Amino acid sequence: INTITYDAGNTTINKYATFMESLRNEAKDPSLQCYGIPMLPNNSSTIKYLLVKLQGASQKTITLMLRRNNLYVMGYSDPFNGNCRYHIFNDITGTERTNVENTLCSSSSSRDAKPINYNSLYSTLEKKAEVNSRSQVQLGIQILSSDIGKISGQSSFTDKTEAKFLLVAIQMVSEAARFKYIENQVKTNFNRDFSPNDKILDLEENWGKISTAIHDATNGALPKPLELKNADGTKWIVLRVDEIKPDMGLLNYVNGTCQTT
Numbered sequence: 001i002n003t004i005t006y007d008a009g010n011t012t013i014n015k016y017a018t019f020m021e022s023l024r025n026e027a028k029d030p031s032l033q034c035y036g037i038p039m040l041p042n043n044s045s046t047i048k049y050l051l052v053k054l055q056g057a058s059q060k061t062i063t064l065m066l067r068r069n070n071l072y073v074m075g076y077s078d079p080f081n082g083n084c085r086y087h088i089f090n091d092i093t094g095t096e097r098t099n100v101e102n103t104l105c106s107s108s109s110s111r112d113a114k115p116i117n118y119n120s121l122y123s124t125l126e127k128k129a130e131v132n133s134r135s136q137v138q139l140g141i142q143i144l145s146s147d148i149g150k151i152s153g154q155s156s157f158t159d160k161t162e163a164k165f166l167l168v169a170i171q172m173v174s175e176a177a178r179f180k181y182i183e184n185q186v187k188t189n190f191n192r193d194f195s196p197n198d199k200i201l202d203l204e205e206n207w208g209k210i211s212t213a214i215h216d217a218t219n220g221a222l223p224k225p226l227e228l229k230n231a232d233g234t235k236w237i238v239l240r241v242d243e244i245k246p247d248m249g250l251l252n253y254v255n256g257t258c259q260t261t
């Protein structure tokens with residue numbers, strides 16, 4: 001397992017970009033790519049996971065453990081009380097959950113669970129973030145950083161805080177990794193909180209669809225228009241990989257073959 005570390009607390013677009021690239025590079029199946037979009041490995045990769053050690057506010061860190069396969073943050077750990085406090089979504093269930101715990105807390109002698117008392121569905125996180133939508137959860141490095149700060153090492157944080165952080169982290173890490181677009185959003189908004197636009201959200205929501213679409217794209221043509229959202233929330237009908245590709249950082253693993261380039 002690898003740790004892409006990203007210090008959200010002190011960072012730069014470029015570092016974030018690098019983080020993204022690292023994250024993508026770490027997350028992606030080295031060999032899988034559809035349309036030049038790296039794709040996440042299946043869930044049978046040697047290295048299933050990836051850690052994203054985010055450092056945020058007060059240099060507090062939260063390590064996201066991302067399943068490389070779908071770059072899901074499976075939970076995260078934060079150094080808490082000398083413990084690897086691992087917080088795993090409660091729908092990280094058994095062996096992954098142990099692996100997530102273990103992975104999160106591999107080089108920590110001590111661990112303590114602070115489960116994410118919720119699954120990682122955005123809806124969940126949003127619910128838990130008590131936001132209607134993570135559209136409402138501003139993303140931003142600072143937010144992430146701060147969020148990291150609100151969570152990492154924090155004996156208590158509400159699910160809300162966590163969920164927000166997760167929303168933030170997930171999006172700024174995984175989604176951003178998944179979607180260059182999102183990455184780009186972050187980067188574009190690097191010095192600011194930003195409300196993830198609909199495209200972020202949409203991409204996020206449609207990543208698998210996109211990945212699928214892209215993966216299943218024949219010579220660039222998405223099997224089906226991907227109805228995505230433009231940044232401004234307008235419908236964005238992607239017909240072709242190339243339309244969406246730029247947004248894509250990672251394709252969700254989609255088995256079978258695709259035009260790798």
Ligand SMILES: *[C@@H]1O[C@H](CO)[C@@H](O)[C@H](O)[C@H]1NC(C)=O
Pocket residue numbers: 009010011
């Ligand atoms: C960020 O880190 C750089 C060097 O890595 C340092 O000069 C700067 O003070 C740090 N900024 C903040 C606000 O953490």
Ligand SMILES: Nc1ncnc2[nH]cnc12
Pocket residue numbers: 070071072073074089120121122170174175204
């Ligand atoms: N936990 C998570 N990690 C990455 N992407 C997500 N999308 C929704 N939940 C997620």
